[PDB]
Each structure stands twice: as C-alpha cells, then as structure tokens.
Amino acid sequence: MSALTQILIVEDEPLIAMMLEDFLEVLDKTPVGTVDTVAGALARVEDGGIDAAILDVNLRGGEKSTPVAEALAARDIPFVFATGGSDDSVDSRFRDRPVLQKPFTMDGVAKALAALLV
C-alpha cells in the first residue's frame, strides 16, 4: 500500500459488482479489477497495482467467514467487509474492521471511502 486510489472488488452477484464499478467511476476513483473469490484477489495482488479491496461476507461455502482475507492483510493490501442483514451476523473481527451494507447510494459511498481512506 502506497496510496488508496486503487481498490479491488469481490462480490457474489454481477448486479452489485456492476454497482461497485459505477460508483468508482462517478467519484473519479481508479478501480483495478473484479473477482468472484478472494483466491482471485490474492492472484491479482501477486501482480501488484492494488492498494486496498472490498469484500462481501455472502461468500459461497464456509461459515460466513474467509481466512484468505487475512492473507491480503499480510501482503499490506487492506480490505473491508460488506453484507446485507444485521450487524450481529458476524464475529467481533468484522466489528473491528470497517463494514458496509449491500445496497449503495451517493451518501453511503461517500462514507464508505471515508472509512477506507482513513
């Protein structure tokens, strides 16, 4: 990490993946890619050119958690959790890291980047 202008996207549905590409182009942000799994986000960090990422908790399989996100934190490329539901559906490790709701809007995206860039 040397800036926070470049964010990777990880999502389980193409509908929200296209919303993340839309809000990053309206806020003059520099997006760098999108993947369906965190193992693909690690393969994109092996190529560099990334500073942070967004990650959904609604991943397939497992128990609403992933150990691969911590490998991104071990490669100095931070991440953020996102989910649709109550805030009690995740462990205290998700309550210590930044969190986001599933639907995006001009007010919620301004607070999402202010929670990442700070």
Experimental technique, in short, is: NMR
Q: Which residue has the tokens 């992933």?
A: 66
- In the chain, what are the domains? 1-118 (3.40.50.2300)
3-class SS of residue 105? coil
In contact, 80 and 56? CB cutoff 8 Å: no
Residue 92 contacts by C-beta under 8 Å, 6 or more apart in sequence? none
The tokens for 3 are 């800036």
